[PDB]
Amino acid sequence: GSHMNDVTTETYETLKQSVLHTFAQLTGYNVSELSLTSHLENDLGVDSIALAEIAVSLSRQFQLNTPLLIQDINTIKDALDGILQREFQLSEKVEPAAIALSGDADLWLGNLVRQIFASHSGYDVNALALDAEIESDLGIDSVSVASAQGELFNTLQLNSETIIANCNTLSALKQCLAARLVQEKGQDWFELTRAPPPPPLRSGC
């Protein structure tokens, strides 16, 4: 019906506010001058250049499945209708990249890390699966993996001074090496492949 479809009464009205706020903050319009039945194009007089950032932010803020198309955003209530058509959460948390990592970045760490453990322990690199537990499935002993870390950092031009807390999964330690980069060598490592610096040091992967 239209009586507490998902959230309580106040919460559902604050839902209006949550979407209203997006229309206001991006354009410079007062959210208190935004009326739910106001057709954006006509009454508020918002055009595509501004409207598009709103549709964009609405899709991102509430973390919708499908991106709202700017031709499909007609009126505020109409947008609200569209919001809930995919996904909506009151008091949604915009979780940023707290870890801030890319699978391409940890990948090259992951290549060498497996090679050393493999060579050291007498196993095959490609047989060393990330979903497979190192000690349990892969059959590598704690000493076998821990001792190999040192020479691994050496082969990786990283501080062998630092140790990897032995994680039983290759996925975990791969993330650990990726963290070592930030903690030992700075965020600079990823910055190279992100923002290409003047000298030929663009290859940060």
Swiss-Prot record:
The modification O-(pantetheine 4'-phosphoryl)serine is found at S48. Disruption phenotype: Cells with an insertion in the ACP domain of this gene show an white phenotype and produce 2-methyl-3-n-amyl-pyrrole (MAP) but not prodigiosin. Cells with an insertion in the aminotransferase domain of this gene show a light pink phenotype and produce less prodigiosin than the wild-type. Residues 10-87 form the Carrier domain. It comes from the Bacteria. It is found in: Membrane. Signal peptide: none annotated. Involved in the biosynthesis of 4-methoxy-2,2'-bipyrrole-5-carbaldehyde (MBC), one of the terminal products involved in the biosynthesis of the red antibiotic prodigiosin (Pig). Carrier of the L-malonyl group (malonyl-S-PigH), which is decarboxylated by PigJ to yield a C2 carbanion acetyl-S-PigH. Then the pyrrolyl group of pyrrolyl-S-cysteinyl PigJ intermediate is captured by the C2 carbanion acetyl-S-PigH to yield the pyrrolyl-beta-ketoacyl-S-PigH. This is 4-hydroxy-2,2'-bipyrrole-5-methanol synthase PigH. It comes from Serratia sp. (strain ATCC 39006). The gene is pigH.
